[PDB]
Amino acid sequence: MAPFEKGSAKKGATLEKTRCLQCHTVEKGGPHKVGPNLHGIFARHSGQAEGYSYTDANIKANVEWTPNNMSEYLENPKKYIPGTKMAFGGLKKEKDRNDLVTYMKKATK
Numbered sequence: 086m087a088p089f090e091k092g093s094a095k096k097g098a099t100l101e102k103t104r105c106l107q108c109h110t111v112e113k114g115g116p117h118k119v120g121p122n123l124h125g126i127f128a129r130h131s132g133q134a135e136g137y138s139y140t141d142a143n144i145k146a147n148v149e150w151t152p153n154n155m156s157e158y159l160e161n162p163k164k165y166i167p168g169t170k171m172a173f174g175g176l177k178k179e180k181d182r183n184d185l186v187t188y189m190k191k192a193t194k
């Protein structure tokens with residue numbers, strides 16, 4: 086894991102498009118896909134998107150989404166919420182996670 090620090094929103098956007106856009110939307114009103122829509126993610130806890138069928142794992146994990154919570158989850162999702170159906174290896178590079186989270190914090194308003 087690793088302490089969140091501000092990154093490049095611009096590079097965070099490129100990291101979303103190529104690594105997240107396939108399974109998630111982020112724009113308000115965006116449709117769910119394989120993954121929930123992520124708008125307001127930092128306004129709520131895990132498994133709270135109305136309209137999406139979550140695993141018991143994600144729902145009951147009760148995570149309070151925040152920048153360092155997002156960073157540690159994205160390093161290894163399946164280690165953070167065991168049982169999650171999110172097929173994502175993870176992002177090893179602190180810098181890539183700080184770039185992505187910094188973009189998410191702006192686009193999920």
Ligand code: HEC
Pocket residue numbers: 100101104105106107108109119120121126130131132133134138139140142143159168169170171172173185
């Ligand atoms: C499929 C190919 C996915 C990719 C690529 C990414 N995500 Fe995902 N994510 C996916 C699923 C199916 C789920 C639901 C998990 C479950 O166990 O039911 C998720 C969930 C998340 C969450 C939590 C959502 C919430 O609790 O409201 C987050 C924050 C999330 N995903 C973020 C995320 C990011 C940042 C990704 C790429 C950079 C990413 N996901 C890729 C499926 C898939």
